[PDB]
Design a protein around this ligand. Structure first.
Ligand SMILES: *[C@@H]1O[C@H](CO)[C@@H](O[C@@H]2O[C@H](CO)[C@@H](O)[C@H](O)[C@H]2NC(C)=O)[C@H](O)[C@H]1NC(C)=O
Ligand SMILES: *[C@@H]1O[C@H](CO)[C@@H](O[C@@H]2O[C@H](CO)[C@@H](O)[C@H](O)[C@H]2NC(C)=O)[C@H](O)[C@H]1NC(C)=O
Ligand SMILES: *[C@@H]1O[C@H](CO)[C@@H](O[C@@H]2O[C@H](CO)[C@@H](O)[C@H](O)[C@H]2NC(C)=O)[C@H](O)[C@H]1NC(C)=O
Lengths: 100, 112, 50, 51
């Protein structure tokens, strides 16, 4: 037995799992391979960027990614590096979405 | 609208259903034909003691044993004898004799 | 039975944590005949945790 | 010490196992087998019957 309750309201499809300061992207065998010291897993992906804009209509993942990248950049890279262009999104093997 | 969330579940569910298979390995037990050893912990100074310290690049060389690997075939006959003349129900108690013998050259050439 | 005594330099020391160019064989057991007849136990080295 | 005790237990089991399976009848049959084998074919002819 259990107490019945109305079905819970909908929530965002993806949660922020990790914030990574150092992640090296490399191109090999027609696929991108991301790696870091903070996570022992290597993420493999196709060369095509995912069209997140037409899926995350609520800008949930967009806001979280943009904010985290700016926080990290301001904290550790502001005086040593420059950001090349706008963030990129990739669907990695194993079912992860990597904002880079 | 939920259509975006729904298609995102679909893409993630699809990507994780892909075959990322790996092989199995039959590991035969080592006989001791090749053996290796390890480094050991070593006591070191509590305070600096060396003189003329310097940094530098180094390249370490080992003696070249030049291993020569090849294929070899071995032939032998395993023999076994028991006291059958007493009957199968009793031979068991009188033990068994066994021997491993090399195959003579004339058998390896003219028969095998 | 005691056979002989080797110097520590007689065996190939494996490099610190990563090593390559190491030679090996597909070891084939060639079990003694007694393991089938007398059903004596075959040596298996020191025990792993498994 | 764990692996030293594990190797002592399988030795105790081998001794208990041997005590149960070391049948006195088998010991007697082994003694008789050796006695008749030493008498040659004249021994085999009798040995097969008395066994
Ligand atoms: C990130 O780096 C920039 C420089 O690339 C910093 O810019 C300074 O910003 C203040 C406030 O607007 C100005 O008074 C300075 O003149 C700027 N300096 C330069 C060299 O342009 C910025 O402060 C850094 N942000 C953080 C959070 O450290
Ligand atoms: C990477 O791109 C390939 C196509 O080049 C995708 O492979 C197809 O995936 C679908 C969905 O599982 C299958 O129905 C097809 O049979 C696949 N095509 C081929 C030619 O193999 C793949 O899904 C993409 N992977 C990622 C992680 O984006
Ligand atoms: C044995 O050592 C040699 C180097 O002396 C290794 O040779 C390299 O092998 C890779 C992979 O084939 C090549 O990309 C390199 O160009 C080779 N280096 C040179 C200088 O030729 C070899 O990989 C080692 N073999 C094993 C099995 O460990």
């Amino acid at each position: 037995a259990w107490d019945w309750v109305p079905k819970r309201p909908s929530v965002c499809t993806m949660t922020k799992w990790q914030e990574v300061d150092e992640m090296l992207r490399s191109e090999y065998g027609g696929s991108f391979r991301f790696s870091s010291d903070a996570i022992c897993t290597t993420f493999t992906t196709n060369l095509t960027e995912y069209p997140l804009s037409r899926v995350d209509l609520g800008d949930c993942i967009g806001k979280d990614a943009r904010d985290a990248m700016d926080r990290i950049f301001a904290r550790r890279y502001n005086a040593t590096h420059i950001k090349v262009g706008q963030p990129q999104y990739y669907l990695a093997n194993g079912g992860f979405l990597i904002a880079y | 609208v939920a259509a975006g969330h729904a298609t995102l579940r679909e893409h993630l569910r699809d990507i994780k259903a892909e075959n990322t298979d790996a092989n199995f390995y039959v590991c035969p037990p080592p006989t001791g034909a090749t053996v290796v050893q390890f480094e050991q912990p070593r006591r070191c100074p509590t305070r600096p003691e060396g003189q003329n310290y310097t940094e530098g690049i180094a390249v370490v060389f080992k003696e070249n044993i030049a291993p020569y690997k090849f294929k070899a075939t071995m032939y032998y006959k395993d023999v076994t004898v028991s006291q059958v003349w007493f009957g199968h129900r009793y031979s068991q108690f009188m033990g068994i004799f066994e021997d491993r013998a090399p195959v003579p050259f004339e058998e390896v050439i003219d028969k095998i | 039975a005691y056979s002989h005594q080797l110097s520590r330099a007689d065996i190939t020391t494996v490099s610190t944590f990563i090593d390559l160019n190491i030679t090996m064989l597909e070891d084939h057991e060639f079990v003694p005949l007694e393991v089938y007849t007398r059903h004596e136990i075959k040596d298996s080295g020191l025990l792993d945790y498994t | 010490e764990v692996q030293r005790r594990v190797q002592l237990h399988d030795l105790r089991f081998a001794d208990i196992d041997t005590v149960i399976h070391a049948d006195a009848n088998a010991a007697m049959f082994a003694g008789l087998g050796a006695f008749f084998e030493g008498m040659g074919d004249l021994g085999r002819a009798v040995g097969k019957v008395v066994m």
